Symmetry: D2
Subunit: 325 residues, 4 copies
């Protein structure tokens, strides 16, 4: 059974733990964050404005945490190499501080006894990025000790882009993602009452996760005042004509097939809040989609930027473990 | 000087009046709304959560209103044919109830003495739509007594699409407009905390205002919880190659020339709120635009869905009067 | 098991139904609402922007609904006397349209075969009000067939006031309740952008539920843009001096005793969202309470204005049934 | 004409500059912020999500700014002791970084050539606090070089409390101020989605600004998701009986005479947004006030926590200058 260590007890780190506590194939054994006291960590785990109260009990034991009775070690080393991951028994480390997004820095965890490291964000260098259901099987334990689970936006676009490209072929595509606040001068403006244009490298990252799409996609983001749940607006030109119904069918096939639990779909009159807590990486909104003609369409896909991503990072760890440490 | 009568004292109707009070070439002489008491009309004109306090003085005079010293006649006739527009000295009627959107219904104002009617929305029938700066000069006074000022979304897309189509040619385009709340099962969901997919006929409406674009554009909308100001996200393929810089220069030219006051532009890192009160119909956001290549681009254009549209209606009323009643 | 009939399938009626589905001592057998098709009712029950997806299954069956394998009859009669409550086997009717708040109108449900009626709001007439945990045992089945569950605000203030008045005696009190949007010219102003002063008859209602406090309290409300969960701010002069600690202990005793499931308490650094879904009628916030001295204090108590109230109405229905229908 | 220097170009600092630019009795000469380039400063000054575009022109001239044809030296020292105020000619400094709130830290601005310093926040040490219209004349230029302009909340409560105490006498009072987001573990929770209990020392601070009220007032705050404008809810016991109408008259008298421009009043059905941009320190809402009896009342007063406070700081600067530098 895989054991996890979390560095950076932020939104992501906290959600990863919550996702583990609900699973029987992965256990969180230790957490590290030099900027959080044990009591504060407990408080932050027990209450959340988006995901509700923690499903279980959280208490402080000495210097550590006792979650649902299980003990979770709590460290505060500003240097990855000094985090007793090994003594803690943590085999895989979830690097979610957003400060060690390079093999160089992230690999320091191995010096702490860790066998593998997953950066919860795209890397600054060439660390391989993996998107569950899209290219995770390309991972080779005998070649990589530090990998990346890309970003929340990339995890929404990649699976949809892959299904579409595989079936009809994407000649070119432009994406706009409408981001909730949990998903540059503009960025500093009041988030509560503004629609804010922003940058996202998701479209390009998809080009890396899916080589065939390199140079064929690019996009931007638009931040809106909602707390959680985002949407991908992908308008692309198809190499082979196709209707929304056929696109819908191809997505349904993948969703019920090779991408079970990763790609989802709906034909209901849903809105943002209906996906809070949804574990899917990408949910196709059939009725929201529109097409000018059989080769120029606009696809809409939902994603709980927090839940989907966090659960994918856990799926990735579990998968890594399954490949042998 | 042109005189105006307003039917329906809602958000648009009130803003049209506030726009007129600023101008010396048109005056509001009568308002008709069978569902609002004058005291309440006074209240709604004096205070606004988006546009601030009314600039001036508003007082009830008997059953009428006294605005900045001028007597504005108030009526409550449910039948447009029975509104005394003629006796009141109102030449042009701003039909903004949203209930009389066909030539048959709107023309009833003419029986009340009005000489011309402008529907503050797209027609359900074939009433001609005019967009200032785009096709308003096609208006023929000897042929139409009832016209339409289209919609806020069309007034944003039309001028931008015209420019792009005139200089580079639009092969095909797909639009997404992020709508503020002042701009169906989904529509009824909580607006305050949801991103809500929605429909708009603006892309097709542009296909009539600009016949050349007929069949080459389509789109949808996405509603978010901001009080005012929306954005048009146009992704299109050009017939001739063009860089963002050249597209910017084209808009800049039109903006400083044939579309002054209508098409605008910026290269600053603006956000939603920066356009509150802006009178332009469409503002190109240079830095927000992105290009995949020289023939496939995504253009971003802001518009205060309330202020721009309301000022265009006044401009159209003034233009109508200049052509002879 | 008592059976419930629901008139008016709005926010309250829907949550009352979702609460019943969580219990075995009460069953919903029918719903009446002339302004909703069966399809729409299903959608509204399945999806919700505050309480999440319906915990279970919902399908349309002919003209009725099948909820978790159970048949719930659907009617659309505008006259309460025309609703076949009796024929549907519904014993108690939850009157939640907000339009039949008098015995005269509410009793019309009895003509349909219903035995008891509970108005989900304070009555416009002398219909008796009952607050679970405060005065519900005063209910006399031989004297009333129509009763009221008061209001969400009253259900939060009554239990707290009773405890304080009994233990220390309330000399006089002034209340301010901060209302979420689910809880007059100002009332019609932009909700998600304003702090809006408003009215509430809670204080006076409490003087009727607890006679001894009649004329000793009065309050007002302040509406804010949060979706759900409200707060009661009670500032009062006590007959007998007391510290916040003593007041807390007092509330604690009641909460663990005679007011179990009704009065709650906490000493954690909670915020609004931590109470979404909480079923208590009132939750004392120890750390938010402050005192100028031992006989002049300000008490802060939370309440999910939707969940607490709806569950109290179900509790009252169960109770009423236990007393002889 | 006094000269002002601004340290910390945040919301307050900027609004303080915008206020100075509208007056002829004071001139902004320099700005310092170790975290902003001159370009970023110009941007933050020209655009604002709450107060609209800058009223005038903003241009970067070398390393400095040219605001409305006037030169404004720009610095970026992280230490007050190293800011060259003298050179620029800055006589009085507006210390608005929120970090140097002690005489020890704040007095360093003098080393730079600055004669007087006004902290835009309640001090941590014994630096004197002044509220224009209440106790600013107590200022002694021969004994203070570093003073405080109190807080936004204190500037709302003090004037009201002074009027009420002078006329009827306040025996005891408890305050709750509903704070907009621009006005502890809870503090860190998502602001745009929660009602958050908070602390404020405003009530106790009033006891120092008005010694007679020492020990007679205390209060708390409740933060809500509105962009700007807050409210003071003062529940107090009076020494002499008084009706809401009489209290209103006393406020009116103070407002039209001795406290003009500071204390204001209204009897309209106002809401939050109606006060955006209001320069008053406190606005009595007549129709929102309520009373249990002639000696126990709840007073409601509004305040633009940004505009009022900022203009008061500028008033205080001009006043400090009149007293001889």
């Amino acid at each position: 059974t895989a054991t996890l260590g979390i560095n950076g007890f932020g939104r992501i780190g906290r959600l990863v733990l919550r996702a583990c506590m609900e699973r029987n194939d992965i256990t969180v054994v230790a957490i590290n964050d030099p900027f959080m006291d044990v009591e504060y960590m407990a408080y932050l785990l027990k209450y959340d404005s988006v995901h509700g109260n923690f499903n279980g009990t959280v208490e402080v034991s000495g210097k550590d945490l006792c979650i649902n009775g299980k003990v979770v070690k709590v460290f505060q080393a500003k240097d990855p190499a000094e985090i007793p991951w090994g003594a803690s028994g943590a085999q895989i480390v979830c690097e979610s501080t957003g400060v060690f997004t390079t093999e160089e820095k992230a690999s320091l965890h191995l010096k702490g006894g860790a066998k593998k490291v997953i950066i919860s964000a795209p890397p600054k260098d060439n660390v391989p990025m993996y998107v569950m259901g899209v290219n995770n099987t390309e991972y080779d334990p005998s070649k990589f000790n530090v990998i990346s689970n890309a970003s929340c936006t990339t995890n929404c676009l990649a699976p949809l882009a892959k299904i579409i490209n595989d079936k009809f072929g994407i000649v070119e595509g432009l994406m706009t993602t409408v981001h909730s606040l949990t998903a540059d001068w503009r960025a500093g403006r009041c988030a509560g009452n503004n629609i804010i244009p922003a940058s996202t490298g998701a479209a390009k990252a998809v080009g890396k996760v899916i080589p065939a799409l390199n140079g064929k996609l690019t996009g931007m983001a638009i931040r809106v005042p909602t707390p959680d749940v985002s949407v991908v607006d992908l308008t692309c030109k198809l190499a082979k004509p196709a209707s929304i119904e056929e696109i819908y069918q191809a997505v349904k096939e993948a969703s019920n097939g090779p991408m079970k639990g990763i790609m989802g779909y709906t034909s209901d009159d849903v809105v943002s809040t209906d996906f809070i807590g949804c574990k899917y990486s990408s949910i196709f909104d059939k009725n929201a989609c529109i097409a000018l003609n059989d080769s120029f369409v606009k696809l809409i896909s939902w994603y709980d930027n927090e839940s989907g991503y966090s659960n994918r990072l856990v799926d990735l760890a579990v998968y890594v473990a399954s490949r042998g440490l």
